[model samples]
Target: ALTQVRRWDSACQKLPDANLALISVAGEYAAELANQALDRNLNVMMFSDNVTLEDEIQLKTRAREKGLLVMGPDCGTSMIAGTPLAFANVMPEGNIGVIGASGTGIQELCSQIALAGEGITHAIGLGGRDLSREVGGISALTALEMLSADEKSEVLAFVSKPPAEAVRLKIVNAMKATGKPTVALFLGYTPAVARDENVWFASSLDEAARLACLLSRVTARRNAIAPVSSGFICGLYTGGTLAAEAAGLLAGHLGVETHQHGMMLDADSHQIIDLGDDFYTVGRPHPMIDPTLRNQLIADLGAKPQVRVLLLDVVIGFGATADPAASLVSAWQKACAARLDNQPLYAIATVTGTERDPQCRSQQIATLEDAGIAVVSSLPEATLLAAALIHPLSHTPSLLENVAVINIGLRSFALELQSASKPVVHYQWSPVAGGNKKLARLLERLQ
Candidate 1:
C-alpha cells in the first residue's frame, strides 16, 4: 500500500521540500526518485534499491556538485555537521573532523581517536570509489575544502585505498595545498613531498590514527616499554596485494631485505624469489586473513637453524579463514612452547577488519593479548615494531621513519594505553560479503 501510494504520489508529482533527505526504496525506482529529487534541487538521500554501481556513482557525483550530501546507494554510516546519520552508532563528540573514501577506514580512524581520549566534531564516509581519478575525487575535495574552512576542525584526516596514479598525485597535491594540518593514510607506497606544515602522509590506518590523536593534542603516558630491534624483518601476508605492499614498504623505506612468498610471488610472477630456505606452505587461506596458517609458518621458520627473526600478518574477514584471534592464540602458544634456548622470536600481527561486528575492537584486542600475541594497528607498524624487537637500528631517522612513530603525550597516559593497546577495528559490511558476519556475530554473542 505504501509502495503504491509512493508511486501514485510520484505520478501526482508531489515532491519532498527539504534541504536534506534520506531516501530508501527499491532500486528499480531510483531513476524516478533521483530525477524528482534533482528536479526539486533537494539533497537526495540514496536509500533506494536496485541502482547499479555506475548509476549510483553518477547520481552521487551530480548530487555532490549541487552542494548536497548523498548518504548512500547502500550507505550505512556517517556523521555530518555533528549530527549522526545513517547507521552511525553512539560517538563521543569533539573538534577533529574526518572525511574518508572508505567506510571502515573512516570508522577505524574515528574509533582510534575516541579510544585515545579524544572526540570527533564530524566524520564523513564518501563511499569507496568516490575519490578516483575517473570520479575526479569531487566529494573528497569538497569535504576537504569544507573541513579546512570550518573553524571547529583543527585537525583533518582521511583514509582511502590507493587511487589511480594521476588521481592519487592530484589528491596528494591538493592536500599539500590545503595548508591545514592533515593526515592521509593512502594504504600503499606513494612518493610524498611535504607540501608545508599542514599536510602529512601516513602509510597505514594505524599511523593515520596516531597522527590524528597527536594533532588533537591527545596526551600519552609511559609504561613498561619494550626495546625494539634494529635489523631486517619480513612480514608474510596471505593476501597478495597486502604482501606486495608490505614488501614495497620494507624495500623502499626501511632498507630491509624483504621477500614475497606463497601467493603474492606466484601471482606477480617475479623472477627473483627469496625465502632463505624458509618453508611456509602449511595452511589454507592467507596467513594474514586466517590465524590457522600462522602456527605452521611460524613453526617451519622456527625449526630452520638459520632464520633469526619472524614476522606475521593476521588478516581477518571474509575470503580468508575465520576466528582470527583464535588462530593468533594458537600461534602464540605454539611459539611459546617451542621457544629455543637462545633464539628469540620477534612477532607482530595486525587485524584489518572494520569489525562491523558487536564484540568491538577493544574486546578482540584483549582476547589476542590474553593469548600473548602483540596486536598492533596496521601491518606496517606491526612490521616496524617487530623489526625494532629483532634489530632496532633499522628505525633510523628518515622521511619514512616518522611513518611509524607513536605520539605519546602526558596526563592521558592510561587513556593512551587503553586506546593504543586495544583500539577499535572498523568493518564495513556489504551485501555481497554479508557485511562482516564474524564481527556482527561476535558483537551479538559477546555483549
Candidate 2:
C-alpha cells in the first residue's frame, strides 16, 4: 500500500493524520474511525445518522478532552479555514465566525453575510442534537471558544432551534465573555428573549442576516414589499429549522390557531414542510441535493388547487445538484399553465448558497426569476413575504381581480373572461368608417 503515496477513501484503518476528517462510512464503522482520527488529534465531521445518542456524546466528550471538535454523528455541513466540508457552500475569508447545529443554518448565515458583501472566516457545524438537554451543547461551547480565540474571527454567531434553556444561558455567558459582538437565532423563542447588551437577537433567518450584517458594519440589502395575497401559505422547505422558524414567526403574528406543522398534507393549515425529513429521505439524498421529490411535489400541484402563495428555499452548494432550478422552474411553469381558472400561484424563493458553489448563486436566482419565482435575501425574508402575502399590514385592491376586458375586435378574449366567471363587458368595435371620402368631407365643412 505504501509502494506509492496515495490518499484512500476505502477504509479508516491506518489512515494518515489530517486536521479535518469527514466520516461517512456505515454507522457501525463511524465510532472506531472517529476515535482513530481523534487519536491523531484530528477534527471529526461525521455523516452517519444511525449512531446511538450515548455514543455521539462519548465521541464529542473525547474530542472536547483533546481540545478538538466533533461536528456530527449526522453533521450536515461545516466550513473552516475557507474549506467546505460535507454539504456546504464555498465562503470567502473574513472576520465573522458562525457555530451552528443546523447545516443549512450555517449555510444560510454565511451565504447571507457574503451576499451582503461581507465574508466569513469559519463556520462550525455541531450536529442538530448538540443543544438538546441530553447532549448539553458540548460541541457548541468548544466551537465558540475556538472561534473566539481565532484572531481572524471578530464577530461570532450561533444558530439552532431554541436550545436547552440552561445550555442557552451557558452559551450566552460564554458569548459575553468574548466581549465581541454576538447575534443568535434561537428559533423556538421570540426575538425579545435574546435582547442583551452588545448582542442582537433574531427571530428569523432573514433577521439574522440583517443583524449579522449590521454588527459586522457591512451593508445589507433587505427590500420591503407589500403583502401579495390572502389565505394560508404553503412553505415547502428542505431545511428543518428553517421551516420551523418560518412557522414560529408566522404563528406570532397570525396567532397559534392559524397554523399547524407535521400535519397530513390532505388536512393543511398553512404547512411549512421539511421535505428533507428522514421519512422523505430514507432512500435518497436530501431534497437540498436531489430536488426530485420537491419537483414531483410542485408537479402534483397541478392535480390539486390553490389560491395561496408558495415559498421555497433553493439551497445550492456542494453535495447539491448542478442547475438546481430546472425542476422548480419547469414545474412552476406547468402549474401556471395548468392552473384551474388561471388564478395565479405566487411562488417566492430564497437561494441558500453563494456564487462560489458549483451552481452559482446569481445564475440560480436568474433561472428562478425566469420561472417567475420571487427571490429574496434569505429564508426568513421569504417567510415574511409569505406572511405578508397572507396577512398584509394594509390592503391594496388588486387590478388583476375583477379585471374587465375592453375587447376592441376580439370577442373570444372577452368570452374567456366570462367563461371563468370574471366580470367582463365587451364593446362591439368595427373598422374605420369611410376612410378617405368621409374624412375629406368633414375637413371641407370645418374649413
Candidate 3:
C-alpha cells in the first residue's frame, strides 16, 4: 500500500515523470533538494527560508539554466493557471499576470484586481529578498519573461515595493524587453515615476491594481469613507505587503509607526505591523494558519486607553483561517467590553478574498459587518475607511483597496464564522502514480 507513495534515488530510483516539486523542507537542505529536483528537470516551489544567499542564488541560477521555475526558499504566495498556491487568493482566471518580490504584496495587488472584476492568469512570486544585490532578481526577470510570453497574459504587473537601485534598473529593463502592457511599483527601487507607451509606474500596490483593472477593463464598485473620531491607527497585519501598504499610505495622513525591520515588540505611535515576518513566526505556524496571536492582539488593542481606530486586514482563501470574522467578532466584543462607557472604537478591514472563494467572499464580508466591523472591498479602502473614521474632513483615499489561508484559509472560517456557515470541504489528497501533463490536471484529479 505504501509502495506507490514512496520513491527515492538509490542509483536507479526516480520520482517518475514529476516535473515539479512542492518543497517545504528545512533551509539547510533546500539547496540539496533543489539541486536534485533540478537534476530531474523539475520546477521547484520551495517553502524553506534561512538558506544562505549563496545557496539560494546558486540553486536558482541552475534552475534558470534548465528553464525551471523556482518560487522560493522563502516565497509564500503565488497563483498558477488560476489555482491558488501557498498563501494566495482564489482569483478569477483571466489575462493578467503578476510577478512580485513580496508574497503579501502580490496577494494585495491580485486581490484588488479580482475585486475590480479583472482576473489573473498566473501570479509568479519572487521571495521578498529576490531583488536584493545578492540575488540580483534572477527569478524576477525570468518570471516576467514567462508571463509576458504567455498568451493567457495580455498585461504584466511587476511589484518590488522597490528593490535595490541596480536590480531595480535591471527589472525595469527586463519589463521593457517584454514589450507587453505593464504596470510597475518599485517604490524605494526607483526615485521617480517611470512611464512609457507600454509601461506605467504605480506609486502603491492599490494603484497598481487599479492600473491593471483599467488596462483589462475590470471595473469595481466605488465607495467613499467619511472620518472616524481621532486617536491613532493601529494595524496588525498577517501579510507584510498589507502592512507596508497601510504604513506607507497612512504615513501622509497620520503618524504611521512601525519598525524598520522585523522583531520589534511594540510601536510607540500610530502603528502598522507585519505579523507575518520571520520574527513573529520563528516558533509558530504562520499567523494565517494560527490566528491565536492576532486574535489576542485585537483584545489587547481594544484595551488600550487611547484607542480610537484599529485597522485589521482579513485575508480569505486556500491557506487562510476558515472564518476570519469569528475570532475578530470575539475580539471586537472584548474591545467594546473593555471600553464600557468609553468612546466606541472602530475595527475596520479590507477583504482580500473574492466572492468566488470557498468561504464565499460576500458572505465573509457580511460576517465582519455583523460583528460591528466596517467592511470594505479592498485593503487600501479598508485602511482608508479606518482613516476616514478617524478624520472625517480628510479626503477619501484616491485608490481602491485590496491572499490565500490568510488567502483561502480565512475563506473557510469566514463563511461559518457565526456557526451557521459551512465547514471545510474535506478531500483526500494524493499524488498521481505518474504526474499529469499539467499540475492543475493532477490537482483536479485529486479533487
Q: Please tell me which predicted candidate would have the highest lDDT against the true structure.
A: 2
Which prediction has more favorable TM-score, 1 or 2? 2
lDDT per residue, candidate 3, 15-130, as tens digits? 23333455555466667767776776666666667778888888789878877777757887766654445676677876788888887888898888888778887888877778
TM-score of 1: 0.44
Q: What RMSD value applies to candidate 1?
A: 20.0
Distance from true position, residue 209, model 3, in Å? 0.3
Q: TM-score of each candidate?
A: 0.44, 0.46, 0.48
1-447 in candidate 2: lDDT tens per residue?
Answer: 121111232222332322455666557667776786677666777766777789889999998778777886877777666455556676766667788889788788888888876788777889888887888889988887777676556667789989767888887887787765678878757865545755668877767876776555421111133333445667788877776676675554344542234331322367777786777777788787778888888766665565467778888888888887877899877876776553556788878889988999999999998876888776555664565455433221111111222222234433543444433334332222445777657655774
Top-down TM-score ranking: 3, 2, 1
How much is the lDDT of residue 204 in candidate 1? 74
TM-score attained by model 3: 0.48
lDDT values, one for every candidate? 0.53, 0.66, 0.66
Note each model's CA RMSD in angstroms.
20.0, 33.3, 21.1
